[PDB]
């Protein structure tokens, strides 16, 4: 009965979120980074280098919004700006050593929080959860 | 894959899912003309009929002064009514208008459709596994 099943899940997800979101936010605030800054750091760990216009695009915000995130990060010495080799006028971002370390400290913090919940799963359920979340995340990236 | 790597892949899938689902739910609400704080006012009135500002404030764990601003704007939108309390007429009761009731159901339907879509990617078997897993994670901690 799909509708009861959706109500069960919604209630489950809503309780997990209210419980996990504050913990994530509090851990971030202590490491000094916001969700948007974390998003930039993660995009740069994955892609190595990105144009300011590329990050703006993925985040669906104005180039100027990213430039302010970049200012905050550069001031904390977590990223560097360089001129693009194809067009000197366009700005590339990349991680510094210190930014790589900061992205890793934040992520490990997030992992440790999640794993307190996930550790109540049996091995069968862990494997199921790996597969379902990966499949949902794949289908969602394709839009 | 080890147990700690699995928990690592799960985290990264959840993170990618959440960063798509959060903005979509927000967007759906912004389009409806209702903030998350306002929705909670509408939800409480739907569930209980009429409440004083203080009672709503207590349920939301925010200051009465905040709920008073929320009520003023909701009244302006014609989503709630403000009336005199029977016991003390200087105290205000809040209740839904039919427009507010409709708005509230529209917001709930918008959220349910966003989640029916993410889950339509799963088989029924997987749906049932996801329900059991989420239910147990919720009851554990």
UniProtKB/Swiss-Prot annotation, chain B:
One of its GO terms (biological process) is response to stress. SUPFAM superfamilies: Winged helix' DNA-binding domain. One of its GO terms (cellular component) is cytoplasm. Keywords: Cytoplasm, DNA-binding, Repressor, Transcription, Transcription regulation. SMART domains: HTH_MARR. The binding of MdtR to the mdtRP promoter region is severely inhibited by adding excess concentrations of fusidic acid or novobiocin but not by actinomycin or streptomycin. PANTHER family: TRANSCRIPTIONAL REGULATOR, MARR (PTHR42756), TRANSCRIPTIONAL REPRESSOR OF EMRAB OPERON (PTHR42756:SF1). Homodimer. This is HTH-type transcriptional repressor MdtR. It comes from Bacillus subtilis (strain 168). The gene is mdtR.
